[PDB]
Design an enzyme around this catalytic site. Structure first.
Site, PDB file in Angstrom:
ATOM      1  N   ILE A  20      30.146  85.061  76.744  1.00  0.00           N
ATOM      2  CA  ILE A  20      30.067  85.172  78.199  1.00  0.00           C
ATOM      3  C   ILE A  20      31.126  84.373  78.972  1.00  0.00           C
ATOM      4  CG2 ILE A  20      27.646  85.902  78.133  1.00  0.00           C
ATOM      5  CD1 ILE A  20      26.714  83.265  78.919  1.00  0.00           C
ATOM      6  N   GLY A  21      31.341  83.111  78.619  1.00  0.00           N
ATOM      7  CA  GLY A  21      32.287  82.309  79.376  1.00  0.00           C
ATOM      8  C   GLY A  21      32.891  81.093  78.701  1.00  0.00           C
ATOM      9  N   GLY A  23      35.451  77.506  79.612  1.00  0.00           N
ATOM     10  CA  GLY A  23      35.384  76.477  80.636  1.00  0.00           C
ATOM     11  C   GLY A  23      35.587  75.060  80.134  1.00  0.00           C
ATOM     12  N   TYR A  25      33.606  72.846  80.316  1.00  0.00           N
ATOM     13  CA  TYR A  25      32.304  72.402  79.850  1.00  0.00           C
ATOM     14  C   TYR A  25      32.032  72.940  78.449  1.00  0.00           C
ATOM     15  CZ  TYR A  25      31.809  76.878  82.244  1.00  0.00           C
ATOM     16  OH  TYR A  25      31.996  78.165  82.694  1.00  0.00           O
ATOM     17  N   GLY A  26      32.986  73.700  77.917  1.00  0.00           N
ATOM     18  CA  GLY A  26      32.879  74.241  76.573  1.00  0.00           C
ATOM     19  C   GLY A  26      32.897  75.759  76.522  1.00  0.00           C
ATOM     20  N   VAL A  28      30.692  79.218  76.134  1.00  0.00           N
ATOM     21  CA  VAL A  28      29.321  79.639  76.393  1.00  0.00           C
ATOM     22  C   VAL A  28      29.034  81.040  75.881  1.00  0.00           C
ATOM     23  CG1 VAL A  28      27.512  79.848  78.111  1.00  0.00           C
ATOM     24  CG2 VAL A  28      29.370  78.223  78.453  1.00  0.00           C
ATOM     25  N   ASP A 138      30.138  67.555  91.953  1.00  0.00           N
ATOM     26  CA  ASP A 138      30.891  68.764  91.640  1.00  0.00           C
ATOM     27  C   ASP A 138      30.146  70.037  92.027  1.00  0.00           C
ATOM     28  OD1 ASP A 138      33.207  70.041  90.708  1.00  0.00           O
ATOM     29  OD2 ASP A 138      32.333  70.355  88.719  1.00  0.00           O
TER      30      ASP A 138
HETATM   31  C1  LIG Z   1      26.372  74.757  82.056  1.00  0.00           C
HETATM   32  C2  LIG Z   1      27.603  75.313  82.348  1.00  0.00           C
HETATM   33  N1  LIG Z   1      27.760  76.621  82.422  1.00  0.00           N
HETATM   34  C3  LIG Z   1      26.760  77.454  82.224  1.00  0.00           C
HETATM   35  C4  LIG Z   1      25.488  76.973  81.918  1.00  0.00           C
HETATM   36  C5  LIG Z   1      24.364  77.915  81.707  1.00  0.00           C
HETATM   37  C6  LIG Z   1      23.161  77.638  81.148  1.00  0.00           C
HETATM   38  N2  LIG Z   1      22.391  78.763  81.143  1.00  0.00           N
HETATM   39  C7  LIG Z   1      23.073  79.816  81.707  1.00  0.00           C
HETATM   40  N3  LIG Z   1      22.763  81.088  81.929  1.00  0.00           N
HETATM   41  C8  LIG Z   1      23.640  81.887  82.502  1.00  0.00           C
HETATM   42  C9  LIG Z   1      24.899  81.413  82.883  1.00  0.00           C
HETATM   43  C10 LIG Z   1      25.884  82.318  83.530  1.00  0.00           C
HETATM   44  C11 LIG Z   1      27.184  81.970  83.950  1.00  0.00           C
HETATM   45  N4  LIG Z   1      27.744  83.030  84.471  1.00  0.00           N
HETATM   46  N5  LIG Z   1      26.832  84.089  84.404  1.00  0.00           N
HETATM   47  C12 LIG Z   1      25.700  83.639  83.827  1.00  0.00           C
HETATM   48  N6  LIG Z   1      25.218  80.145  82.667  1.00  0.00           N
HETATM   49  C13 LIG Z   1      24.338  79.334  82.089  1.00  0.00           C
HETATM   50  C14 LIG Z   1      25.289  75.592  81.840  1.00  0.00           C
END
Ligand SMILES: c1cncc(-c2c[nH]c3ncc(-c4cn[nH]c4)nc23)c1
EC number: 2.7.11.24
Length: 335
Positions: A20-21, A23, A25-26, A28, A138
């Protein structure tokens, strides 16, 4: 095993991985939890070479494990190597949300009713954070996670502090401008203000090529600040710039947002004041007439115990940070 050619070793409990992503933050991924029979979010972090990342990682883990609130993301599980030597990566398992506010505002339009409810959840969560004596530092649309049911959670506490190189500056309060100190609770309030403005028009209220440009956009809307409000101290350069400028006139909020609720604009105004001492605080913001349909102190809980890092994490070397991370993650191991 592999996602986009990168290792992602989270089985056997977690399978059906979907990227999914990326960043700071790592990495994901989404994944099917076999145990709880639901898809989850898993964040892979590899922080042990840089003392900075080890700080961010430790803060995140420690903060989210102590925090417990509807509008704050939690940690379901942490996967890492059984021995400290083998631990190169750390996977944090979190609830899978459908999207973030950044992705939503990029393509979708919000009605006032949604805006009002989203803002409420933001502040409700922020009250808990501030009662914990913690600054987020942030806040941005991408750090606000959402469900289709309109439930919202704040995430990414990697830069949080107890009450430097910067990426995005669009949500930073003018007093922090340039690379300065994240000092008061009012900086988060300013960030929420910018987020509210973006929800109303689907565009950043204060963009800028550089901080002087950004400051000019801010004065372009708020108008020239009074000498009293000109408490821009953390830079000679920034302060000398502002003093040189001609008078700038305040743009009426309803001129910028002609379709917005008047109460929304009134509260927006109190969040986006140049002087941080003059900005509305979170508890007074929750009590604003704009949010009166959701307002309920008995349903707006505070932190059970305020935060205070027992050691200055900035002073700790990366090897000891790794130790504390290992210790912190132990409770997600058998025994
Ligand atoms: C810290 C940093 N980045 C994402 C998370 C995260 C935890 N659960 C999630 N569930 C959906 C998403 C998402 C992002 N973009 N679309 C969906 N992100 C997260 C935590």
């Amino acid at each position: 095993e592999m996602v986009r050619g990168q290792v992602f070793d989270v089985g056997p409990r977690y399978t059906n991985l979907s990227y999914i992503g990326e960043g700071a933050y790592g990495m994901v991924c989404s994944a099917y939890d076999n145990v709880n029979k639901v898809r989850v979010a898993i964040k892979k972090i590899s922080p042990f070479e840089h003392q900075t990342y080890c700080q961010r990682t430790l803060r995140e883990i420690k903060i989210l494990l102590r925090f417990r609130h509807e509008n704050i993301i939690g940690i379901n599980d942490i996967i890492r190597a059984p021995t400290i030597e083998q631990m190169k990566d750390v996977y944090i398992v979190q609830d899978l949300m459908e999207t973030d506010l950044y992705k939503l505002l990029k393509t979708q339009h919000l009605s006032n009713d949604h805006i009002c409810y989203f803002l409420y959840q933001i502040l409700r969560g922020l009250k808990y954070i501030h009662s914990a004596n913690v600054l987020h530092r942030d806040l941005k649309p991408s750090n606000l996670l959402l469900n289709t049911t309109c439930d919202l959670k704040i995430c990414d506490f990697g830069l949080a502090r107890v009450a430097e190189y910067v990426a995005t500056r669009w949500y930073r309060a003018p007093e922090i401008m340039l690379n300065s100190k994240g000092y008061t609770k009012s900086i988060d309030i300013w960030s929420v203000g910018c987020i509210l403005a973006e929800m109303l028009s689907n565009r950043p209220i204060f963009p800028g090529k550089h901080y002087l440009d950004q400051l000019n956009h801010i004065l372009g809307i708020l108008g020239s600040p009074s000498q009293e409000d000109l408490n821009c101290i953390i830079n000679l350069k920034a302060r000398n710039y502002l003093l040189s400028l001609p008078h700038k006139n305040k743009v009426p909020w309803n001129r910028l947002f002609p379709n917005a609720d008047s109460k929304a604009l009134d509260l927006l105004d109190k969040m986006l004041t140049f002087n941080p001492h003059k900005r509305i605080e979170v508890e007074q913001a929750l009590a604003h007439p704009y949010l009166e349909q959701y307002y309920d102190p008995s349903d707006e809980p505070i932190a059970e115990a305020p935060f205070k890092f027992d050691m200055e994490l900035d002073d700790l070397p990366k090897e000891k940070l790794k130790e504390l991370i290992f210790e912190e993650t132990a409770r997600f191991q058998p025994g």
